[PDB]
Ligand binder design. Structure first.
Ligand SMILES: NC(=O)C1=CN([C@@H]2O[C@H](COP(=O)(O)OP(=O)(O)OC[C@H]3O[C@@H](n4cnc5c(N)ncnc54)[C@H](O)[C@@H]3O)[C@@H](O)[C@H]2O)C=CC1
Ligand SMILES: NC(=O)C1=CN([C@@H]2O[C@H](COP(=O)(O)OP(=O)(O)OC[C@H]3O[C@@H](n4cnc5c(N)ncnc54)[C@H](O)[C@@H]3O)[C@@H](O)[C@H]2O)C=CC1
Lengths: 278, 301
């Protein structure tokens, strides 16, 4: 069956252009009731709404800053009586070599990207819980996953978003609230990522807590792997940095690495290590 | 040969107790000139006192080492480095360890609950590190430690603010690793497990007393030693065990075909492939990621 969002209210932030607008247009065309938001920095959002209405879809605009998150969800509620999907897309760039990053260059990036997504997602959270339905998208970036010269501020905010999502996955799974994160990328058409966002935000999708790099027509998934590592301490004998150095190769050897999935498992391993030594 | 830090100046933020304290004592015992910083407040973000830092500096002195205290909040990062510059004249290593908790279920995290965690953990580390950056570049040497956590890596109920800040620190380090390379400035991240005032509520009491901060100090000392070459690593450490983490990426799927609109249904149809990790690759750079997307265009056309 073709992917429809009929009756689903979808809030997209920073949807005045690029990726956002492309999601706004992709969603509405499949029956979604879209709340198009964009700080317009008011004509930015209005233009996309128009495109949607003209296309035979339904939508309304919101002109507030994601910093004013509560307001973006209010527009979804006051206009459609609910909120099902939140795509956190709003973002800006303030690239500088690390030493030249001013306090403001840092703060503004955290405010729009991270604090913005926290405010908006927090405003919709209880509504999603009470109704037992929610699909959330966080927009990370390769610069966050890998790092990238001149983007210390941006890379920290993007991975911070992943951290936020990891927890939301835990707190929301019981109420059918899914949260996934993407790292998207002239020829790199925004319509090449939109389909992944639509799938990840569909009611038939069961993916929760995934991290995805998207671009050019390709999609890949990322996860952590951890080395079996080494116990470099013996009971009654103080642990030394020399033991760490002398076991460095083993500690860093990824052969048969585990694929850790929760904090419990990690904590459980540490407690078992303590028991083996004792 | 035993690892020493003679002639090295080490700044440890939040060295008044727990992990920070164990690090400062270990460094000082090995010859390092240590600036022990601590705001002297509680683990919830309320308070200020000079005794936290003063006691550690006293313990170090009694053990025959040399240290000086700094009482500023990491939020005033630049001042910690100044204490290092004014007292010893250089700054070789920065261990960003200062931290607090403000646990609440997501819906109940207030704006201040969020902002204060970010200010101290992330913004504070950025401030302290940024203040030492040019000094390390001039010295053509530097060792930096960011303290993340398992809750940031895996997520953890009631800590959305904390977990975002902690992985946020990792994204900061990812970049510092690239920018500090030519100047021998290494930056590594750790996710420690040690019993402290900050962990009682998530650890049976006896487990608290048994998971010593002294079991993680050894790793921190090695990663900050001149002879260590590790740069940009992420390590989980506790009880005497150490392990390393890294990303693995699926080979994935090209769901788009030449002149044929890409659809959501196509993505759904290639889901098993997209999520299969057999022969996954181990990506390490944004350039290789960008090179890859560009190769996808070529393969398709
Ligand atoms: N296009 C690409 O290659 C990549 C994009 N990304 C991320 O994708 C997202 C959007 O990317 P693009 O469309 O390419 O960029 P963009 O800059 O065109 O889109 C951001 C949108 O955010 C809106 N905005 C800015 N501040 C706002 C605020 N305070 N409140 C509400 N809206 C606000 C802007 O008006 C703009 O339309 C961002 O989060 C960006 O970091 C990440 C990696 C690569
Ligand atoms: N112990 C554990 O199992 C884990 C610890 N961590 C992290 O390790 C670090 C240290 O944790 P613990 O030693 O266990 O806790 P702790 O509470 O004993 O030590 C933290 C120290 O930071 C100081 N501090 C707080 N806010 C400060 C500020 N603004 N400026 C300067 N100093 C400040 C406190 O006074 C305290 O001495 C933190 O960043 C924590 O989030 C992360 C995961 C697990």
């Amino acid at each position: 069956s073709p992917l429809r969002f009929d009756g689903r209210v979808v809030l997209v932030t920073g949807a005045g252009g690029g990726l956002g607008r492309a999601y706004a247009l992709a969603f509405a065309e499949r029956g979604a009731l879209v709340v198009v938001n964009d700080l317009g920095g008011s004509s930015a959002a209005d233009k996309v709404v128009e495109e949607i209405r003209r296309r035979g879809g339904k939508a309304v605009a919101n002109y507030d800053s994601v910093e004013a998150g509560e307001k973006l969800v209010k527009t979804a509620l006051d206009t459609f009586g609910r909120i099902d999907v939140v795509v956190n897309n709003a973002g800006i760039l303030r690239d500088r070599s690390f030493s030249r990053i001013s306090d403001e260059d840092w703060d503004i990036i955290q405010r729009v990207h991270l604090r913005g997504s926290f405010q908006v997602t927090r405003a919709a959270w209880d509504h999603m819980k009470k109704q037992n339905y929610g699909r959330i998208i966080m927009t990370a970036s390769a610069s966050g996953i890998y790092g990238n010269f001149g983007q210390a501020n941006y890379s920290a905010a993007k991975l911070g978003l992943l951290g936020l999502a990891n927890t939301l996955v835990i707190e929301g799974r019981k109420n059918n609230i899914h949260c996934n994160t993407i790292a998207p990328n002239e020829a790199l058409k925004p319509e090449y990522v939109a389909p992944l966002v639509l799938w990840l935000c569909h009611e038939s999708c069961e993916e929760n807590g995934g991290l995805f790099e998207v671009g050019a027509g390709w999609i890949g998934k990322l996860r952590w792997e951890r080395t079996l590592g080494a116990i470099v301490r013996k009971r009654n004998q103080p642990m030394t940095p020399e033991a760490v150095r002398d076991n460095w190769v083993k500690i860093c050897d990824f052969s048969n690495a585990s694929k850790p999935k929760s904090i419990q498992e990690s904590t459980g391993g540490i407690i078992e290590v303590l028991h083996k030594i004792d």
